[PDB]
Write a protein that binds this ligand. Structure first.
Ligand SMILES: *[C@@H]1O[C@H](CO)[C@@H](O[C@@H]2O[C@H](CO)[C@@H](O[C@@H]3O[C@H](CO)[C@@H](O)[C@H](O[C@H]4O[C@H](CO)[C@@H](O)[C@H](O)[C@@H]4O)[C@@H]3O)[C@H](O)[C@H]2NC(C)=O)[C@H](O)[C@H]1NC(C)=O
Ligand SMILES: *[C@@H]1O[C@H](CO)[C@@H](O[C@@H]2O[C@H](CO)[C@@H](O[C@@H]3O[C@H](CO)[C@@H](O)[C@H](O)[C@@H]3O)[C@H](O)[C@H]2NC(C)=O)[C@H](O)[C@H]1NC(C)=O
Ligand SMILES: *[C@@H]1O[C@H](CO)[C@@H](O[C@@H]2O[C@H](CO)[C@@H](O[C@@H]3O[C@H](CO)[C@@H](O)[C@H](O)[C@@H]3O)[C@H](O)[C@H]2NC(C)=O)[C@H](O)[C@H]1NC(C)=O
Ligand SMILES: *[C@@H]1O[C@H](CO)[C@@H](O[C@@H]2O[C@H](CO)[C@@H](O[C@@H]3O[C@H](CO)[C@@H](O)[C@H](O)[C@@H]3O)[C@H](O)[C@H]2NC(C)=O)[C@H](O)[C@H]1NC(C)=O
Ligand SMILES: *[C@@H]1O[C@H](CO)[C@@H](O[C@@H]2O[C@H](CO)[C@@H](O)[C@H](O)[C@H]2NC(C)=O)[C@H](O)[C@H]1NC(C)=O
Ligand SMILES: *[C@@H]1O[C@H](CO)[C@@H](O[C@@H]2O[C@H](CO)[C@@H](O)[C@H](O)[C@H]2NC(C)=O)[C@H](O)[C@H]1NC(C)=O
Ligand SMILES: *[C@@H]1O[C@H](CO)[C@@H](O[C@@H]2O[C@H](CO)[C@@H](O)[C@H](O)[C@H]2NC(C)=O)[C@H](O)[C@H]1NC(C)=O
Ligand SMILES: *[C@@H]1O[C@H](CO)[C@@H](O[C@@H]2O[C@H](CO)[C@@H](O)[C@H](O)[C@H]2NC(C)=O)[C@H](O)[C@H]1NC(C)=O
Ligand SMILES: *[C@@H]1O[C@H](CO)[C@@H](O[C@@H]2O[C@H](CO)[C@@H](O)[C@H](O)[C@H]2NC(C)=O)[C@H](O)[C@H]1NC(C)=O
Ligand SMILES: *[C@@H]1O[C@H](CO)[C@@H](O[C@@H]2O[C@H](CO)[C@@H](O)[C@H](O)[C@H]2NC(C)=O)[C@H](O)[C@H]1NC(C)=O
Ligand SMILES: *[C@@H]1O[C@H](CO)[C@@H](O[C@@H]2O[C@H](CO)[C@@H](O)[C@H](O)[C@H]2NC(C)=O)[C@H](O)[C@H]1NC(C)=O
Ligand SMILES: *[C@@H]1O[C@H](CO)[C@@H](O)[C@H](O)[C@H]1NC(C)=O
Ligand SMILES: *[C@@H]1O[C@H](CO)[C@@H](O)[C@H](O)[C@H]1NC(C)=O
Ligand SMILES: *[C@@H]1O[C@H](CO)[C@@H](O)[C@H](O)[C@H]1NC(C)=O
Ligand SMILES: *[C@@H]1O[C@H](CO)[C@@H](O)[C@H](O)[C@H]1NC(C)=O
Ligand SMILES: *[C@@H]1O[C@H](CO)[C@@H](O)[C@H](O)[C@H]1NC(C)=O
Ligand SMILES: *[C@@H]1O[C@H](CO)[C@@H](O)[C@H](O)[C@H]1NC(C)=O
Ligand SMILES: *[C@@H]1O[C@H](CO)[C@@H](O)[C@H](O)[C@H]1NC(C)=O
Ligand SMILES: *[C@@H]1O[C@H](CO)[C@@H](O)[C@H](O)[C@H]1NC(C)=O
Ligand SMILES: *[C@@H]1O[C@H](CO)[C@@H](O)[C@H](O)[C@H]1NC(C)=O
Ligand SMILES: *[C@@H]1O[C@H](CO)[C@@H](O)[C@H](O)[C@H]1NC(C)=O
Ligand SMILES: *[C@@H]1O[C@H](CO)[C@@H](O)[C@H](O)[C@H]1NC(C)=O
Lengths: 127, 435, 108, 139
């Protein structure tokens, strides 16, 4: 079945580079778009961008313009997420999601509603 | 008879090496010398050279130097909020075609628009707003695409070992190896889920893969019957010629000359039965006691599920769901025309903003053609994939997939490799050097 | 730009009642394409409906989406104790889309 | 150009034939050669590429005939050294090598030993250029 398994926790110092990874198992990773969202304790979810492993098309939100970069490996069925700078306010639980299948009767963006999620890894800046 | 080491010079030992092969063609025109008027070929004889089309270092040489020549012919975004509505009309249902707002100072068919809505109080009037599909992509450049039979040749000091055994399967040894300095006609036509204008086989339909018992490996199927196809656009578009910038062109064509006939395709259902009937007969050999079920493709990006064409300069995206759509329990069965044989069609969509060259990401704009568009090609190959599922009850489902872009070229470079000649070799004998 | 609002934040419900959800967006969705989530404490999030009324795969018939314009609502007929979790709202899938506040199907 | 092995280099035999039959058919082919008994644009570009393939093979031949001077086989085709053939390097009984294996199967047989034998040939040659040199210094 379709399942996304993320890596373990990664407690790093502020100013380091956290490398969160995803892993596709029950489908062809080179055909679906992977999303990354952020969840802080008590706050709301927040989109961080997406990567298209098929054609290498990348798009990230304006809030994380020069802070988060996206890289993916097709031959290993894994999606990576690098962080340039850190801050104590970034202590949150990172996720990983997968877009839905495309139908013949809809717009090219009506099928990006994050169907399959992943077991969310957590990062701590100062413990 | 004591043995002694002796060095010989001129041994025919081979060593597989990599290089930068040069193109060759009749007429896209840079660095391509004319074709060889004397294509010499020498049959070696009783040699068995193990080939491997999956670990070949020539496909990377063809995947490169083809994005390179493609980039040489492309040397701009202007993403603004659009505004449109449905067009005033085997029939077209919803194809938005309108004009936008301010360019500098005070027609995008269907797969290049993204709906939105402003925060004003015009919500009670239903005023929709669009956006370009590659509004947040890196570089959106803008530009005839005709495939020429490029011939790759070996440089000075290297050779090409072309096998001739009609029972290829992708790897293993060959028994009829011949040397050539160039190759046959290779058409660099880009397409997914079907190989157009390829090279037919000499015996029955053969399949090939790196590991047939694996699911992530692409299963390339080469046919032996040139199945024709007839895709055309019966509409009629007129060049608008919108100039935006200091001496810059743009062409968002469109005209109402009966915009009701949707572009489709026609495939001979009688010929399509004989092809799939022989494919299941071959797939049953490697997969015994199983039902070779064919099924719909996956989802995600619209350029993955659909077939990619190139008809005179326009790209067609066709829903290949009516194709294969069956179960196929035993060999050559489960037909569905009830006496019809009425040209099984494929509904097609047409894009203008193209996510060019899978893998990197750099879009482009396709200039439309003034008038009617009609094309015809030969379906000679097939790309497939196996769904590895634990619900396997003797029904291994297959999908068209599309795989990587390099798989469209492994179905033509599977017959040869590039080798280097190491001339010295040692061997023992009974002679001795005088000292 | 886009800010979602949800009400009520809590629900004094018992197993077998009916819940009322609402996602009044700051804007007005023209296409009427949203989604709803289910986030249990400790587990992974789960998609409820993949559309304004199109439910996701494996979701039971008790969940049913409805509404248009800005009255993005939901209803759970014959609630069960296995659904007491946090529910979030969606906007669209584009260059900008936020997330809802979050309700809670409280057992009390 | 002798032997007809379909390549410019690799003239000591044809690929496919055994090691013994390639040398027995080479001397017979060599006797017949010493006795002497019996568009334009696409033609001027491919006339050059056939020359570049032949001139490069001549330069590689003349270079390798002089690089063999480190082994004492300077300017020879079928040389002969004095290094003892170790039995652990695939013994195979000499008459069975030339009559059964070709050059392709033999190179795959001692692929792990060619880098070690190439060093023993240089060591044995330095001993020849040292022992036969001291004999002249005594005079
Ligand atoms: C697979 O191979 C087949 C066989 O080549 C191929 O079909 C060819 O398609 C092209 C493109 O439509 C055809 O070329 C046209 O032919 C007409 C009539 O001969 C010409 O008038 C056309 O020239 C005009 O259009 C050009 C493009 O706009 C202009 O550059 C030009 O100046 C003229 O205005 C054009 O040459 C060709 O005739 C067919 N061939 C056959 C045998 O039908 C097919 O397209 C290939 N498949 C794929 C996917 O490419
Ligand atoms: C391309 O167009 C075809 C047809 O318009 C689409 O294929 C259709 O896919 C749906 C589900 O994916 C099938 O629906 C189901 O069919 C079964 C059997 O008929 C029926 O019992 C169910 O109730 C359900 O309706 C439908 O049959 C199928 N149509 C055909 C002709 O195979 C396809 O989805 C389109 N491509 C894309 C990418 O959407
Ligand atoms: C082994 O491979 C070689 C090719 O490398 C095969 O030779 C080819 O054989 C076919 C027919 O057997 C030849 O086609 C015809 O040949 C005649 C000869 O003059 C020609 O006039 C015809 O127009 C036609 O081309 C083909 O030319 C020939 N090719 C070469 C290079 O000799 C051979 O058949 C293969 N053997 C096996 C057992 O597979
Ligand atoms: C071709 O592939 C498609 C999907 O890639 C298959 O369609 C979907 O198949 C699954 C597996 O059976 C269906 O899921 C099940 O549906 C029942 C319906 O009651 C549900 O109770 C189960 O819990 C399970 O979710 C799914 O419904 C179906 N999709 C649709 C739209 O019906 C399709 O079956 C494949 N083709 C063939 C011939 O099998
Ligand atoms: C993706 O592209 C759009 C442009 O189409 C960017 O939207 C602009 O955002 C800025 C920031 O508020 C506004 O001032 C502009 O008016 C917006 N453009 C339009 C046409 O409204 C968007 O920022 C881009 N994404 C990123 C991450 O930069
Ligand atoms: C392609 O064909 C060759 C020979 O027909 C296959 O090689 C043999 O495969 C069988 C079983 O797969 C082995 O038992 C033999 O030892 C193999 N022989 C050699 C010389 O390798 C090869 O496996 C086939 N490849 C595919 C992908 O079908
Ligand atoms: C080709 O694929 C098959 C299955 O897709 C591979 O067989 C499996 O190999 C793994 C790793 O050794 C084993 O754990 C499994 O038990 C094997 N399957 C069975 C049914 O025994 C096979 O190894 C692949 N071959 C290559 C060369 O990649
Ligand atoms: C596509 O396939 C058709 C049929 O297989 C090819 O048409 C043949 O063309 C040759 C030379 O033009 C004729 O000698 C044959 O008689 C034609 N076949 C028939 C059935 O009439 C066509 O050339 C193929 N096109 C390409 C680009 O390969
Ligand atoms: C696609 O179009 C071609 C011609 O453009 C069709 O080829 C003709 O087929 C008929 C029989 O159906 C023959 O009598 C003609 O001689 C063919 N034309 C030529 C030039 O040889 C082809 O049949 C069409 N395919 C489909 C499925 O309709
Ligand atoms: C299948 O498609 C072909 C198109 O290739 C149809 O052939 C057309 O038939 C009409 C009427 O007989 C002619 O006016 C056209 O000129 C034909 N087209 C071509 C390219 O020759 C064929 O009729 C279709 N089959 C059925 C049963 O409708
Ligand atoms: C492709 O083939 C289909 C047949 O399935 C053609 O559709 C029919 O075309 C005839 C004209 O020959 C019309 O009278 C019918 O009303 C059409 N039926 C349907 C269901 O569309 C189609 O015209 C062919 N297209 C081309 C370009 O040849
Ligand atoms: C369209 O352009 C006009 C100026 O020509 C401007 O007043 C108007 O605000 C623009 N519309 C939008 C939605 O930006
Ligand atoms: C296509 O459009 C042009 C310009 O509108 C017109 O001159 C031409 O006649 C049209 N073609 C047909 C077949 O009517
Ligand atoms: C197919 O199934 C039959 C019935 O169990 C069995 O006898 C036969 O050996 C099977 N075929 C293969 C290739 O295993
Ligand atoms: C073919 O017939 C039926 C499917 O309707 C099934 O009972 C039978 O087992 C099938 N045969 C094989 C070999 O799958
Ligand atoms: C295959 O597709 C055609 C065209 O859509 C359809 O008429 C036919 O019923 C399909 N076959 C099956 C088994 O659904
Ligand atoms: C397809 O081919 C098989 C081959 O025997 C045949 O049984 C079947 O009737 C054919 N169907 C059609 C529609 O031609
Ligand atoms: C190769 O072997 C075949 C027999 O399979 C024989 O007829 C032929 O003469 C041999 N050729 C060479 C060059 O050894
Ligand atoms: C031959 O090989 C053996 C390996 O067991 C080694 O001990 C011995 O020294 C070798 N002799 C020569 C002359 O290389
Ligand atoms: C020759 O070497 C092989 C190993 O390559 C060995 O099996 C064989 O016994 C050896 N022969 C003798 C006579 O020792
Ligand atoms: C090797 O050649 C000899 C003849 O010199 C022959 O007797 C023997 O059978 C050959 N070996 C094999 C394995 O055929
Ligand atoms: C060389 O040795 C390695 C291990 O020592 C072995 O795997 C390899 O097969 C050998 N080379 C050849 C050509 O057999």
């Amino acid at each position: 079945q379709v399942q996304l398994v993320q890596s373990g926790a990664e407690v790093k110092k502020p100013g380091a580079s956290v490398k969160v990874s995803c892993q596709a198992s029950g489908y062809r990773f080179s055909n679906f778009v992977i999303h990354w969202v952020r969840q802080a304790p008590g706050q709301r979810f927040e989109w961080m961008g997406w990567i298209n492993p098929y054609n290498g098309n990348k798009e990230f939100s304006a809030k994380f313009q020069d802070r988060v970069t996206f890289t993916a490996d097709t031959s290993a069925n894994t999606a990576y997420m690098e962080l340039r700078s850190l801050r104590s306010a970034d202590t949150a639980v990172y996720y990983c999601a997968r877009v839905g299948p495309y139908s013949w009767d809809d717009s090219p963006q009506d099928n990006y509603y994050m169907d399959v999620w992943g077991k969310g890894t957590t990062v701590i800046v100062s413990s | 008879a004591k043995k002694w080491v002796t060095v010989y010079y001129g041994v025919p030992v081979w060593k597989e090496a990599t290089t930068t092969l040069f193109c060759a063609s009749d007429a896209a025109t840079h660095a391509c010398v004319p074709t060889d008027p004397n294509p010499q070929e020498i049959v070696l004889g009783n040699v068995t050279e193990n080939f491997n089309m999956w670990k070949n270092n020539m496909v990377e040489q063809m995947h490169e130097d083809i994005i390179s020549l493609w980039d040489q012919s492309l040397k701009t975004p202007l993403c603004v909020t659009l505004n449109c509505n449905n067009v005033n009309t085997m029939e077209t249902g919803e194809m938005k075609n309108c004009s936008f707002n301010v360019t500098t100072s005070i027609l995008f068919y269907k797969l290049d628009v993204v709906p939105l809505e402003n925060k004003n109080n015009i919500n009670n009037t239903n005023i929709t707003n669009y956006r370009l599909i590659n509004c947040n992509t890196s570089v959106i450049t803008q530009a005839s695409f005709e495939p020429i039979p490029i011939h790759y040749c070996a440089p000075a000091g290297f050779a090409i070992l072309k096998c001739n055994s009609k029972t290829f399967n992708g790897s293993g040894p060959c028994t009829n190896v011949s040397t050539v300095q160039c190759t046959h006609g290779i058409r660099p036509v880009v397409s997914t889920q079907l190989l157009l204008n390829g090279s037919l086989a000499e015996e029955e339909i053969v399949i090939r893969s790196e590991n047939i018992t694996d699911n992530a490996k692409t299963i390339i199927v080469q046919l032996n019957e040139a199945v024709e196809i007839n895709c055309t656009r019966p509409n009629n578009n007129t060049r608008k010629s919108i100039h935006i910038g200091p001496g810059r062109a743009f062409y968002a064509t469109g005209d109402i000359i009966g915009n009701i006939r949707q572009a489709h395709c026609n495939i001979s259902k009688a010929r399509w039965n004989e092809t799939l009937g022989q494919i299941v007969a071959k797939l049953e050999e490697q997969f015994p006691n199983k039902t070779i079920i064919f099924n719909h493709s996956s989802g995600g990006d619209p350029e993955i599920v659909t077939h990619s064409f190139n008809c005179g300069g326009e790209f067609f995206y066709c829903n290949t769901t009516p194709l294969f759509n069956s179960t196929w329990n035993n060999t050559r069965t489960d037909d569905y025309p009830t006496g019809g044989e009425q040209n099984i069609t494929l509904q097609c969509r047409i894009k203008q903003i193209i996510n060019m060259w899978q893998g990197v990401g750099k879009a482009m704009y396709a200039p439309p053609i003034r008038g009617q568009i009609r094309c015809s090609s030969n379906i000679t190959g097939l790309l497939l994939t196996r769904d590895g599922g634990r619900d396997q009850n003797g029904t291994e489902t297959f999908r068209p997939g599309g795989g990587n872009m390099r798989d469209n070229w492994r179905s033509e470079l599977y017959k040869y490799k590039v080798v280097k000649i190491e001339p010295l070799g040692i061997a023992p004998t009974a002679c001795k050097r005088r000292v | 730009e886009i800010v979602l609002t949800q009400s009520p934040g809590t629900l004094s419900l018992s197993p077998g009642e009916r819940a009322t959800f609402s996602c009044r967006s700051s804007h007005s969705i023209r296409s009427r394409r949203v989604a709803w989530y289910q986030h249990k404490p400790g587990q992974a999030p789960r998609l409820v409906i993949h559309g304004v009324s199109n439910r996701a795969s494996g979701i039971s018939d008790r969940f049913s989406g409805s509404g248009s314009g800005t009255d993005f609502t939901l209803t759970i007929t014959r609630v069960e104790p296995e659904d007491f979790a946090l529910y979030y709202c969606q906007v669209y899938g584009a260059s900008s889309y936020t997330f809802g506040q979050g309700t809670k199907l409280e057992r009390k | 150009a002798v032997g007809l092995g379909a390549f410019i280099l690799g003239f000591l035999g044809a690929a496919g034939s055994t090691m013994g039959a390639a040398s027995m058919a080479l001397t017979v082919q060599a006797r017949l050669l010493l006795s002497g008994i019996v568009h334009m644009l696409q033609l001027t570009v491919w006339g050059i590429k056939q020359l570049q393939a032949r001139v490069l093979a001549v330069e590689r031949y003349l270079r390798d005939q002089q690089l063999l001077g480190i082994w004492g086989c300077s300017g020879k085709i079928i040389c002969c050294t004095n290094v003892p053939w170790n039995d652990s390097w695939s013994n195979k009984t000499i008459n069975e090598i030339w009559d059964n294996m070709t050059w392709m199967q033999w190179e795959k047989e001692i692929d792990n030993y060619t880098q070690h034998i190439y060093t023993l040939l240089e060591v044995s040659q330095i001993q020849q250029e040292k022992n036969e040199q001291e004999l002249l210094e005594l005079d």
